Amino acid sequence: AGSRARVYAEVNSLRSREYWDYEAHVPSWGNQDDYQLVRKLGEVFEAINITNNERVVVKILKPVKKKKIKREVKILENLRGGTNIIKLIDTVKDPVSKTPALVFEYINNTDFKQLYQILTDFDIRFYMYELLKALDYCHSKGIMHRDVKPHNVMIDHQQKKLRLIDWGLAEFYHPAQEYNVRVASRYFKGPELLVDYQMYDYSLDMWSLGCMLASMIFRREPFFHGQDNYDQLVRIAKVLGTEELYGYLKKYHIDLDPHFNDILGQHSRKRWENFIHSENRHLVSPEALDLLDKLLRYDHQQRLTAKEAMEHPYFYPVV
Numbered sequence: 001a002g003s004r005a006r007v008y009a010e011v012n013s014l015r016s017r018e019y020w021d022y023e024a025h026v027p028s029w030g031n032q033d034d035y036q037l038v039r040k041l042g043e044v045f046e047a048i049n050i051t052n053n054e055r056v057v058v059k060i061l062k063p064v065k066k067k068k069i070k071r072e073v074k075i076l077e078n079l080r081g082g083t084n085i086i087k088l089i090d091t092v093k094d095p096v097s098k099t100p101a102l103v104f105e106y107i108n109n110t111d112f113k114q115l116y117q118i119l120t121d122f123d124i125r126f127y128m129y130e131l132l133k134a135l136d137y138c139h140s141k142g143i144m145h146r147d148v149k150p151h152n153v154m155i156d157h158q159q160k161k162l163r164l165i166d167w168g169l170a171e172f173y174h175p176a177q178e179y180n181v182r183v184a185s186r187y188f189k190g191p192e193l194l195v196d197y198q199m200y201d202y203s204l205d206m207w208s209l210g211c212m213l214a215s216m217i218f219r220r221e222p223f224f225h226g227q228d229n230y231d232q233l234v235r236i237a238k239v240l241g242t243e244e245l246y247g248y249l250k251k252y253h254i255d256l257d258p259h260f261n262d263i264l265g266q267h268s269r270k271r272w273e274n275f276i277h278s279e280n281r282h283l284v285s286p287e288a289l290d291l292l293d294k295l296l297r298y299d300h301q302q303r304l305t306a307k308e309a310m311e312h313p314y315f316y317p318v319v
């Protein structure tokens with residue numbers, strides 16, 4: 001009977017159909033002439049609202065779509081006011097091209113490739129906890145982000161502000177729904193996507209969060225560095241173990257692609273303590289590893305929910 005989410009499983013069915021039927025959504029498209037598109041945001045531009053000189057972000061959409069446009073707008077409107085969710089301010093079209101764009105609150109991002117090098121133990125806990133606030137909220141709202149990765153987590157370290165951005169791959173969760181496994185970005189794809197298992201849920205985002213946690217406390221970014229989707233499962237199983245992978249597959253009646261038979265090899269399950277060395281020892285703790293172990297596990301249904309992760313001792317200093 002496949003699997004279902006342990007939490008927020010039925011919350012979309014309990015809501016008005018208009019909430020999740022994004023194909024029926026009809027956005028109110030404003031005039032993009034209200035916006036002065038000043039610079040590329042270091043197809044997203046920094047812009048100034050001509051009316052009130054307030055700075056914003058404008059993201060230009062792809063006009064030929066329709067379906068993914070209605071889906072991203074609807075999810076963003078549903079998530080408005082959500083904790084650490086990037087705030088959609090307006091939906092507009094260029095008056096000449098009719099091309100849709102989205103207007104977002106401005107956030108001064110610090111490139112994660114520099115930021116992560118000066119984060120302390122406290123910082124990582126702090127920001128992971130902020131990120132969890134966002135994920136618990138969108139999952140409570142019946143939405144999987146499906147593309148959690150450092151590039152989609154904007155952080156202003158001066159102001160200690162975090163925002164989960166780019167909801168273009170987000171979907172509504174409905175129990176027993178089969179989804180596209182070509183979602184997320186390679187390094188952060190959960191094992192369920194890599195073995196063509198389509199009945200996944202919110203716990204896909206928790207695997208990606210776990211990937212981020214691992215790279216921050218261990219200083220190996222990305223942590224699972226696949227060269228393609230096939231090799232990505234290989235990198236994971238070099239850590240979580242190959243016999244452990246087969247167990248997972250056995251449990252959910254998943255048959256592994258015959259291509260894997262020649263490249264998977266045989267690998268033992270590594271203890272997380274094996275990734276500790278002098279260069280990350282000040283970021284790692286037993287509480288960090290015990291949390292990580294409960295996120296990066298094959299069995300999506302057994303992974304901690306965002307809410308459970310928030311209750312973990314690792315965030316005791318930031319609650």
Ligand SMILES: O=C(O)c1cccnc1
Pocket residue numbers: 041044057059086104105165166167
């Ligand atoms: O894609 C987005 O949602 C996005 C990108 C940059 C800034 N604000 C939002």
